[model samples]
Target: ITGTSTVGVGRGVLGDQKNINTTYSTYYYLQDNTRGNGIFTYDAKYRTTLPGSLWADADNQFFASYDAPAVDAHYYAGVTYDYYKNVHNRLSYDGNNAAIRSSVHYSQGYNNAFWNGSQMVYGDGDGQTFIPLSGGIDVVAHELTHAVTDYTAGLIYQNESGAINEAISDIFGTLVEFYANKNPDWEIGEDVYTPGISGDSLRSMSDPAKYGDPDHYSKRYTGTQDNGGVHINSGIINKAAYLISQGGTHYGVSVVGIGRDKLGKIFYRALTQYLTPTSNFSQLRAAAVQSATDLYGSTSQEVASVKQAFDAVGVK
Candidate 1:
């Protein structure tokens, strides 16, 4: 819709107030024109639709409990947009400022969020399990990272490649979380998962096994479920990523922490330059090692740490 770009006040699902860039014609629509081409959020209305209806408001103030999901979906999309651009110098998910689209309240008790190739979809979980997934900054970033991977690496989402793809999203998701400083941690969806519970997340990058995910390659799941255990096996790579950013010892191997910035740079380089549709764990190790070497030199501690992180995870 064509309208003058405007600002709206809204409270997110977590009950935090923020300013959201909206568009105003006859109604204030959740179409943020300030970032990229735009960041458009929609209302799914408890239905299974793509982008659903463009969220509109009579007043520019969004404080209703029903508006929480849309508020976070729209606001956090902008945050993720800023994260990619400010931290990595990437214009948007496609590096060309592609308009970001997201839909909230996907279905009744849906309990999950995803990138549907063209846009993002968030489910309003059955309050006992989850509230609104978009409420989690890391969740939004994780979904957007999938878009980035599709545009760059094109990593086939199956088996090892799929695990790599999932891990990449987790890595960048956590990086973007730290970028925004939104309760920054190595946890995946802690902010939006299990509203009734506290201090628990969908997954843990620091300790994947905390949720029964394999932290070592030898412990990887070989089952054909979950697209060849894409989510399950991502733990190995996720653990390596954690080790690179924050030093840790695993399997009697120690990695010197290279910090988050370098970790992000190496992974970003590898994702854009080295990873292919079929890149596996061993290949990912090679890509990360070469990426570190490219950014910090072959003899640099960054490269050595990359090697050590993968070794600690038994990737090599």
Candidate 2:
């Protein structure tokens, strides 16, 4: 965990000038830079409340001695909290006073990490292919975002629900990674994967078809495993957000574009404002487009780009 940068321009000037309120109160502008705030990490071990090992410590193979798990968890959680607050003006995970908890070194040789019903669990990885999951902000945000989605849409854990679940997490997951790395590129999980292996895996938001992998969201993309590949179909929503945010030729072609800030505002509004338990891909796409039009105006390029990206993905 490390410090993060915020993007915005500050206003509020002289007293008498404030009274002469023109449309340009202070000339709003967008600026991106780091705040120098460092990451927060904590430590906690499996106590009696939760089972540390199965069969009475028979499987107690993984242990952490020096580093702190709670430290990393707290840092990631604080970033998320501040992101929603500064960007969307929301507090905590539920728009109310709520607390988040994370656990690391969850199990021995655990290859994957997931957010179970309440708390978050981390794995020490298999030592060869995977390391500790805490190595990346996307991984941290990916797990914690489940709580946000659950509190919002209550998306079920299968099929469409599964895709929505994975999509929302991947959306913010990549954004969190971008915000953490301070890089606008759309590469995910580059930090967690092993260098010897592909090290480019899990998902790609900028160009989902770049890897030429059949499982990706290409013409031959298939839905298998990983919960119908919720992580796989998530490419659709991820690309939409990327194109909308970056506002340029996607994958080296002028497919579609939108104003970056408006795109973010629309997405933030639609996800937090209109999304419901039954909403699916089409519904979300429509809601976001409408949100853009409503907030920025129907004829705005922001609305146009949202629609174009959805159409490019064949979201229907």
Candidate 3:
């Protein structure tokens, strides 16, 4: 309720407005063991094909074994779908008319999960090192938001484009988590990963330095790993968006400002509706400020704070 807008509002009643909780089902996919079968897959040659184990009765060990993971994935997808639909008022992932499709339990012992352009894909986990990648709405939404980015900015998954791409995903992923109010902290992947791991979460937007890393941008921001280090260097853009949205105490820097819901609304609106595929950091900064000014006013504090936070995160 803190952030409200009319951008994607006229998409009609998104899933029964009266009984929101009953609008979706989570247990059906788990009990039926059909959630993973719906995912689009490819072989070692990257040739598109139905996964070999998908829906095969003999491969029930993969699908039938863990009910908790399947249940969690279904619920997480439903929650993320509802969050975007009801909160932002977007009908679905593409914002036009594409039905959301998610697949749980991807490659066995796979530690990472992602949305490969069309649908969400998950891993069964090594069981010894990691568990199935579910039980967290942010991680689910993070993968789905990648689809949203592909449909929107189409930011190339390399260099700054990759950073912006990851930032956009993290931005909405964090928002989805906050919207659910599942946890007070706005960290990503904290709940989904195993607690025994050295780092419970992948990234920390609020305090990026807590991972024993630098807060500001540096020469080693982007590299070859992680698709041009998209997920790694994304900390910069993530911190930028975080500082602009929530306005919290910087890791080592002085307090810039707080209460940034209004700013976040403007940035998200511009990101989904405006920004182009070739948009750069300067372009994003200009467009975001313009979005704030247009939505609020020329002299609005939201606009000023947004601009300041962008600068604080080294936008210029």
Candidate 4:
């Protein structure tokens, strides 16, 4: 809608206080115009209907318990947008200043979130397994990164390509978390996953095997479920990314860390320039190595670390 931009103070699902971008006409609405074209957030009202309604409040203050999820969803979307623009120089998911949209409270105890090809959708978790997924900046960034992959690499969403797609989200999601400097770690969904469990997350890039995920190529899942184990096998690539950002030894192989910024640059280049719809693990290794070479030369430690990282994860 058309309105004047305003700022609102609110507490997120995790009880962290922050300021949010809002729009004011007659009532305050969760629409941020500071980034790209705009960042719009909606309410699903625990229903299956998508993008249900624009969240509006009579007052600009969002302190109510029910407003927690919506506030975080809107706020986190803006943060993710900033990360892509400020760090990556990418306008939006499409790199065209596209309007970013998201919906929260998608269903009663839905327990999961996803990008449905166009916009982001989040579930208010059952409270046992999760609270509200948007409460986690990593989860929000993960879903938004899916849209980025869709617009860029267009990686096929199954088998090896699909696992690559999932891993890409996890990679940038962790990067965005670190970029925000908010208790960052190499764990995905740690902030909003399993409220009863601390130090546990939906997935662990630092140690994929910690959550029964494959840390080596030899352990890749070849099952029919989960879109050919897209989520499960993503551990292989996730481990490689982790090793690149932070040096590690895995399966008798050692990788020298090249730091997070270089890791992100290499992967971003590979995703936008080299990867294709059917690219597999071996192809991804080539892309990453070439990307690092392009950025820091073949003889540079960056390129060597890229090779060692993939080798350590058994991707070669």
Scored by CA lDDT, what does every candidate get?
0.93, 0.58, 0.60, 0.93
**What is the total number of backbone clashes in candidate 2?**
9
Residue pairs in candidate 1 whose N, alpha carbon or C atoms collide under 3 angstroms: none
Model 4: per-residue Cα lDDT over 1-316, one tens digit each: 8999999999999998999999999999999989989999998998989889999989999999899998998998888999998888999999999999999989899999999987899999999999999999899999999999999999999999999999999999999989998799999999999999888899999999999999999999998999999999999999999989899888878888989999999999999999999999999999999999999998999999889888887777
Predicted candidate 3 versus true structure: per-residue lDDT over 94-201, tens digit per residue: 776465554555655677778767667677567644566665677778888888778877778787677777778877888787777777455777765664764557
Indicate whether candidate 2 or candidate 3 has the larger lDDT.
3
Residue 9, model 4: lDDT of 91
Note the clash tally of each candidate. 0, 9, 0, 0
RMSD in Å for candidate 3, one decimal? Answer: 9.0
Q: Which ten residues in a row have the lowest lDDT in candidate 3?
A: 5-14
Error of 2 at 203 (Å): 0.9
Residue 43, model 1, lDDT: 92
Positional deviation of residue 8's Cα in model 2 after best superposition, in angstroms: 29
Which ten-residue region of model 1 has the weakest summed lDDT? Answer: 43-52
lDDT (Cα, tens digit) per residue for candidate 1, span 1-316: 9999999998999899999999999999999988989999999899996778999999999999999999998988898899889888999899999999999989899999999999999999999888889999999989999999999999999999999999999998899889888879999999988888899999999999999999999999998899999999999999999999899889999989989999999999999999999999999999999999889898999999999999998888
lDDT of 2: 0.58
TM-score of 1: 0.99
Cα deviation of 250, candidate 1, in Å: 0.9
